[PDB]
């Protein structure tokens, strides 16, 4: 799956739960999904966030620079389809309405946003 990726790189991801903490993950954009790994050479992704139907927007954050958000525009407060692993082996659906992401630089933010937008638009099943 991870052959011929559209982009890879480090991003920070804000965790979707009650306290919410930032975690540094290695992301791979491929097959119109964002896969993320704890460490770059990990065999198994920690999660997958399919991009189909999603949109992207810039946001400003109090603590993290170079941020954007993925969200589902079709319905407000709609949960984003996604899946992750837990250390005990559970494979669970995500519970995010938004994914806030911080890129390592303004340049990388622009590159990631452009790559994500292009991937969403190339999907032949986009907006259906």
Swiss-Prot record:
User: Where does the PH domain start and stop, copy by copy?
Assistant: 4-121
Q: Where in the cell is it found?
A: Cytoplasm, Cytosol; Cell membrane; Cell junction, Adherens junction; Cell junction, Tight junction
Chain residues that bind a 1,2-diacyl-sn-glycero-3-phospho-(1D-myo-inositol-3,4,5-trisphosphate): 13-14, 16-21, 25, 36, 46, 95
Result of altering residue 84 to A: Abolishes phosphatidylinositol 3,4,5-trisphosphate binding
Q: Which domain of life is it from?
A: Eukaryota
Tell me the disulfide pairings in this chain. none
Question: Oligomeric state and partners?
Answer: Interacts with TAMALIN. Interacts with FRMD4A. Interacts with FRMD4B.
The record's function comment reads: Promotes guanine-nucleotide exchange on ARF1. Promotes the activation of ARF factors through replacement of GDP with GTP. Plays a role in the epithelial polarization.
Q: What is known of its domains?
A: Binds via its PH domain to the inositol head group of phosphatidylinositol 3,4,5-trisphosphate. Autoinhibited by its C-terminal basic region.
Protein name per its UniProtKB record: Cytohesin-3
Whichever gene encodes this chain, its name is Cyth3
